[PDB]
């Protein structure tokens, strides 16, 4: 159920933020499974045929974080800001 | 108030010290030295302790003014 | 010679030191006659009554 690195595990019908997928307010993106999000269970190429669909939900500048670094005795103190851009996705699994 | 200054026609000075940003500590000067010192006089022809090229060399001739001719 | 303290002490310890300095409350009773309040085994100070009268009102 993977998507730009991270695998995921969905049941049916939910949100999941991933990263900068293309399109805007309501495209229609689809991915090929590695695993059954529930019943009977099947895995791998035996389950790529079984796939999921998932409609877009939103574009996102996530929660703030800072990037600070320090090394003693040098005066090395670094201060930067950072937000990781994500996309919100509605699960519509086959 | 309309106006504006020519791009690059006024450079903002250097105020040394002030942060690690920045020119931390020292102020360009490094660590110790005779150079480190709030004090005049060094100066510019003072090589070494020593004796200088400047005074190591033959004094040739003298100095006459003369009539110099306009081209 | 001349021992001093090494480091300033904290609000925390310091107030753990004080943990006992807490005053104990005079355990009092009301004095069968004049009716103020007497200390057990002493004279009820208002009237002067230990069983009849002594020090005076």
């Amino acid at each position: 159920i993977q998507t730009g690195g991270k695998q995921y595990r969905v049941s049916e019908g939910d949100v999941i933020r991933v990263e900068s997928l293309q399109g805007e307010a309501g495209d229609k993106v689809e991915l090929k499974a590695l695993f059954v999000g529930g019943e009977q269970t099947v895995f791998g190429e035996d389950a790529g045929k079984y796939t999921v669909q998932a409609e877009v939900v939103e574009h996102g500048r996530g929660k703030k974080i800072y990037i600070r670094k320090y090394k003693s005795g040098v005066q090395y103190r670094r201060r930067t800001g950072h937000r990781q851009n994500f996309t919100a996705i509605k699960i519509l699994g086959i | 108030h309309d106006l504006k200054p020519t791009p690059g026609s006024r450079k903002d000075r250097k105020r040394v010290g002030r942060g690690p940003g920045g020119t931390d500590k020292t102020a360009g000067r490094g660590h110790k030295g005779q150079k480190s010192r709030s004090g005049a006089g060094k100066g510019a022809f003072f090589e070494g302790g020593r004796s200088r090229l400047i005074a190591r060399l033959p004094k040739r001739g003298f100095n006459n003014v003369g009539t110099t001719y306009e081209v | 010679k001349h021992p001093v303290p090494k480091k300033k002490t904290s609000k925390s310890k310091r107030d753990m030191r004080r943990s006992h300095h807490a005053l104990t409350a005079p355990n009092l009773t009301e004095c069968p006659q004049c009716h103020g309040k007497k200390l057990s085994h002493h004279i009820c100070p208002n009237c002067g009554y230990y069983d009849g009268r002594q020090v005076l009102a």
């Binding site: - | - | 300095h21 005053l23 409350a25 005079p26 009092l28 309040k37 200390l39």
Partner: protein, 127 residues
Amino acid sequence: FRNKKQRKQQVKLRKPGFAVAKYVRMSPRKVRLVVDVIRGKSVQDAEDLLRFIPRSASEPVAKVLNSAKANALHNDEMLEDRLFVKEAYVDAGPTLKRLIPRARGSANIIKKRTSHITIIVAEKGNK
């Protein structure tokens, strides 16, 4: 209401059960020591306990409990036979600094702490 100014116009501050020993010549912590026994107790109790606590700061403290009871009964129309010590505390005054000479040439700043002793009396009922 609307304006802060309007609220200022309309209401006024009433202080219910409160009185203040200001600028009293005694160190905070000492005086607290008396006062820790008054707090939250049947206000008359406080008048009694404060007759048999043998510390020096018994008396200014009691003086302020009659003031409170006074202000509470009169100025605030309260109920003597159910009045009590809702609050009690003390904080620092402007502490009074003078020099003491010492061995050899040295000198010393010796501080005569003052106290803002303060009690708030109130009505205590369970239901």
